[PDB]
Amino acid sequence: TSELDDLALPRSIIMRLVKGVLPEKSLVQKEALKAMINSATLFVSFLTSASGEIATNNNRKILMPQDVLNALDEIEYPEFSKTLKKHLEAYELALKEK
Amino acid sequence: GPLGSMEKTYGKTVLPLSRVKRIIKQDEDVHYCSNASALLISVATELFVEKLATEAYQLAKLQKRKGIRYRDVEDVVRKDDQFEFLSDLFSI
């Protein structure tokens, strides 16, 4: 879609994430990087939708950080939870400071 | 630290938040996504990319290759339950 292309996150930042978990000098071809850039967009939407449901089921209009954390269980990515909780704690800590 | 071990700053994403929010805003059912929520969604997306790249590389490695090919990414979506939500994008 032209919609996917319009929404796509920057190719270079995604490339760096990909190469970050691969051995030095591994290559990544165009069709593959593209597929992962587009997959990332669908993941944003996927997690967002599941989080918004939990907000709704809690009769809340604001999609809150705890909704995202609980959505990890619903979309079956609970292995991200410990890392996200660490970010949330640091985020709130920086916020008070800044 | 330069001459020390790598130290991550948590609470930040490498993604451009405006672009992540633009995708978030396409959801018809969401009234408002807070900034803290957007940040967590962004970091989760980083972790997702890493996960997908790792699985795709593992398949490349089994075929004695050093690089990720498109069919590697596709075979990951084809075989792995966690990537079911991508099944339409890859037309499998």
Overall size of chain A counted in residues: 98
Q: Which is nearest to B53 in space by CA: A8, A34, A18, A40?
A: A18
Chain B, nearest residue to A82 by Cα:
B44
Q: Is the CB of residue B29 less than 8 Å from the CB of residue A52?
A: yes
User: How many Cα atoms sit within 13 Å of B5 on the Cβ side?
Assistant: 2
Look up tokens 């991200």; give the residue.
A80
| Domain residue ranges of chain A, discontinuous segments joined by + | 1-98
CB contact under 8 A, B67 and A29: yes
CA gap A66, A1 in Å, rounded: 32
Question: In angstroms, rounded to a whole number, what is the distance separating the alpha carbons of residues A57 and A29?
Answer: 42
CB-closest option in A29, A42, A88 to B85: A42
Experimental method: X-ray
For domain A1-98, the CATH superfamily is Histone, subunit A (1.10.20.10)
Q: Are the beta carbons of B39 and A91 closer than 8 angstroms?
A: yes
Beta bridge partners of A25: none
Whether the Cβ atoms of residue B22 and residue A25 lie closer than 8 Å to each other: no
Task: List, in order, residues 6 or more apart from A47 with CB less than 8 Å away.
Answer: A68, A71, A72, A75, A77, B41, B44, B45
Of B24, B26, B89, the CB nearest to A39: B89
Question: A-contacting residues of B 58-87, CB under 8 Å?
Answer: 66-70, 72-74, 77, 81-83, 85-86
Do B10 and A41 make contact, defined as CB atoms within 8 angstroms?
no
As given in the structure block, the two tokens for residue A41 are: 């967009």
